[PDB]
Design a binder for this molecule. Structure first.
Ligand SMILES: [Fe+3]
Ligand SMILES: [Fe+3]
Lengths: 193, 195
């Protein structure tokens, strides 16, 4: 019942920040696969009519195919929407980041360092905890929603998100990322809280 | 205090199974980074003067526990991993004989290994271990090592994506099949003797 969403841009639109070979394989193999495995593990169960957000909200935060693939699907679904070739650092969440970090660049430093420390596969997140902003990281395809915090910006730091172009150089990937953040979508997600 | 091992063969010696550029980067970057960060963690501690096997079997102060579990694990696992690969893989010796006994054949051991190696979600390792006399196949997350839970690793496959992504991208099962063509069974046997 879950469909693999189409990208709002062409594969090359994020160059030379995210390579077009990565984008293709990331979307068409990795995300496609989480979608199929997810559908397969949801046939017949308690979770059949559910939004992925709700499925993910009701997992454990401590192995199951719905945790791995369900998070896979959600994390990546947000992530294509959080990238844009037209990135303008403005709007409600930019301002709210200045109000809590002092400046946008202090925030990115904290983000970049939390993202580079996530050892193994995972995701680096800007979340909303009871109204206030927070940077968290998660292992594998886990998502802050499972811990009661709403993700508004995510960076995928599985090696598959950046190995073709950047190999081991994840801080060069995290740096290229800032040039492609759809801050209009970050706003949209903040606003739903 | 710890130093980056040399590879026991050239960087292109495991072609066409494992590509040269992966081996170069895996070794000179990923592995050298685990060494750097492990030395930084054990600057002035009693662990600086211990054998890495003992350091990982004995997980150590809380504040550097995680740096050591991650980078110490990383140092050992890759150090084992290089010595476990050979340009002249030859499927014979004691452990292969013991595999054939406990699994029936080598092909069914490899299938069991392949499936577990494929199942490990996210980063990690697939191991053939000795556990109280018998052979079991286990996977660990990240750089964890079965030593830490008593078990003796005698073969290990790196399933972190950096280990296969340049040549194989998402096709971890193709990587796993290539692995068989470079396993160094003389090393598996050597490690098996220690028990
Ligand atoms: Fe991903
Ligand atoms: Fe590795």
């Amino acid at each position: 019942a879950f469909e693999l969403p189409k990208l709002p841009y062409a594969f090359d639109a994020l160059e030379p920040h995210f390579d077009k070979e990565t984008m293709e394989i990331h979307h068409d193999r990795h995300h496609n696969t989480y979608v199929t495995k997810l559908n397969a593990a949801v046939e017949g169960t308690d979770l059949e009519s559910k939004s992925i957000e709700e499925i993910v909200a009701n997992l454990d935060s401590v192995q199951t195919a719905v945790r791995n693939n369900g998070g896979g699907h959600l994390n990546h679904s947000l992530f294509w929407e959080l990238l844009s070739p037209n990135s303008e650092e403005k709007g409600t969440v930019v301002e709210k980041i200045k109000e809590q970090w002092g400046s946008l660049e202090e925030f990115k430093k904290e983000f970049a360092d939390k993202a580079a420390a996530r050892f193994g596969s995972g995701w680096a997140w800007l979340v909303v905890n009871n109204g206030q902003l927070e940077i968290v990281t998660t292992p594998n395809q886990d998502n802050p929603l499972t811990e009661g915090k709403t993700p508004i910006l995510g960076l995928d730091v599985w090696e598959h998100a950046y190995y073709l172009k950047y190999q081991n150089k994840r801080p060069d990937y995290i740096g290229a990322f800032w040039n492609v953040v759809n801050w209009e979508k970050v706003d949209e997600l903040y606003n739903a809280t």
